[PDB]
């Protein structure tokens, strides 16, 4: 069923809450035993948001390999994403260790450091060229190379150095700065312009490791970004773009991380983004 007609049918019937609860009921439940070990309590931002054991990213260290991060591997679309929480004061070194070890080119940030008057994630990148950051626990150095501030997003060029080998890599930081403190954007225009700036950079392409995507918990805004990207890629690949079922794609993604799309309004926004986005994939 053409999703644009499914959309109008749910809107006219006002059934978004019902559709969303059906997804919650059918979603996968896999063990997260490593996330719940006592040694890992200060590595989790939220007690109710944990990576599954089967899909969690492992740090390359014998001490403690745990980070709150999941590999979302989309087999038909040929895309992979790492979805993670906003870094905590004691996990900023782990965060950059993961980017290094997984060979990521891009980090996608969908929150502000402060929202609703509370801290939603650590200040984990440098704000001035001449004030670099050193992560002594993981032996990494991080330098701000350039910053491009736009109305709806900021792009930063960062240099990450493995101090153990003196290898360096260029990381791109894509920071969506205008998601509202409450609810979802009235239009999906800026978020879609943003997704396509990430695509144009190479950060989502198979010559690199998976993109790292986060918000505060790494499930709500983060889930909207990967869901919209994968649905648009499937529409460009299939003979019948109308066969793409956003609810079925979301349930596939929920096999790899719990809770993706946190509200009925985020579900409606994801439909709007794919619909309004589709009016280009198809040749405009």
Ligand X SMILES: CCOC(=O)[C@@H]1CN(C(C)=O)[C@H]2c3cccc(C)c3O[C@@H]12
User: What is the end-to-end Cα distance of the chain in Å, rounded?
Assistant: 22
Q: Which is nearer to ligand X, 44 or 230 (CB)?
A: 230
Binders of ligand X among residues 193 to 252 (CB under 6 A) are 193, 196
- Known binding residue 220? Answer is yes
What the block records as the tokens of 193 is: 């312009």
User: Does residue 159 contact residue 145 with C-beta atoms inside 8 Å?
Assistant: yes
CB 211 to ligand X: min, Å: 17
**What DSSP state is assigned to residue 209?**
B
Nearer CB in complex with ligand X: 67/110 = 110
Residues 168-197 that bind ligand X (CB under 6 A): 187-189, 192-193, 196
Q: How many residues bind ligand X (CB under 6 A)?
A: 9
- Secondary structure letter of residue 123 according to DSSP: -
- Kindly state whether residue 106 participates in binding ligand X, applying the rule CB under 6 A: no
The answer on whether 202 is annotated among ligand-binding residues is: no
Q: Which is nearer to ligand X, 95 or 225 (CB)?
A: 225
Contact between 277 and ligand X (CB under 6 A)?
yes
Active site residue 231: no
Interacting stretch for ligand X, rule CB under 6 A, among 4-12, 85-93, 123-131, 276-284? Answer: 276-284
Side-chain-facing half-sphere of 190: CA atoms under 13 Å: 16
- As a whole number of angstroms, the distance between CA 180 and CA 263 comes to 14
Question: What CA–CA distances, in Å, run from 271 to 22, 41, 259, 261?
Answer: 16, 36, 17, 12
The reply to whether 282 sits near ligand X by the rule CB under 6 A is: no
67 known member of a binding site? no
Report whether 274 contacts 3 (CB < 8 A). Answer: yes
- In whole angstroms, how close is the CB of 150 to ligand X at the nearest point? 11
Burial of 181 (0-12, 13-18, 19+ CB in 10 A): exposed
181 assigned to a ligand binding site: yes
Mark the binding-site residues for substrate, compressed into ranges: 181, 215-221, 262
In the complex, which residues of this chain contact ligand X (CB under 6 A)? 187-189, 192-193, 196, 276-277, 280
């Amino acid at each position: 069923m053409e999703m644009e007609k499914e959309f109008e049918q749910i809107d006219k019937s006002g059934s978004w809450a019902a559709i969303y609860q059906d997804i919650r009921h059918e979603a996968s439940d896999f063990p997260s035993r490593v996330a719940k070990l006592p040694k890992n309590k200060n590595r989790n931002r939220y007690r109710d948001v944990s990576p599954f054991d089967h899909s969690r990213i492992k740090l390359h260290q014998e001490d403690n390999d745990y980070i709150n991060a999941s590999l979302i591997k989309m087999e038909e679309a040929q895309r992979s994403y790492i979805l993670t929480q906003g870094p905590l004061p004691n996990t900023v070194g782990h965060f950059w260790e993961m980017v290094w070890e997984q060979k990521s080119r891009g980090v996608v940030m969908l929150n502000r450091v402060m929202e609703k008057g509370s801290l939603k994630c650590a200040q984990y990148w440098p704000q001035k060229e001449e004030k670099e950051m050193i992560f002594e626990d993981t032996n990494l150095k991080l330098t701000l190379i350039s910053e491009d501030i736009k109305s709806y997003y900021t792009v930063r060029q960062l240099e990450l150095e493995n101090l153990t080998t003196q290898e360096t890599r260029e990381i791109l930081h894509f920071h969506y700065t205008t998601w509202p403190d409450f609810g979802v954007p009235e239009s999906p225009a800026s978020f879609l312009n943003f997704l396509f700036k990430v695509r144009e950079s190479g950060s989502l392409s198979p010559e690199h490791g998976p993109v790292v995507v986060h918000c505060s918990a790494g499930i709500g805004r983060s889930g909207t970004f990967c869901l919209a990207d994968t649905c648009l890629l499937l529409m460009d690949k299939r003979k019948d773009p109308s066969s793409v079922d956003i609810k079925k794609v979301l349930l596939e993604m929920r096999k790899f991380r719990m809770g993706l799309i946190q509200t009925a309004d985020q579900l409606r926004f994801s439909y709007l983004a794919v619909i309004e986005g589709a009016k280009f994939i198809m040749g405009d």
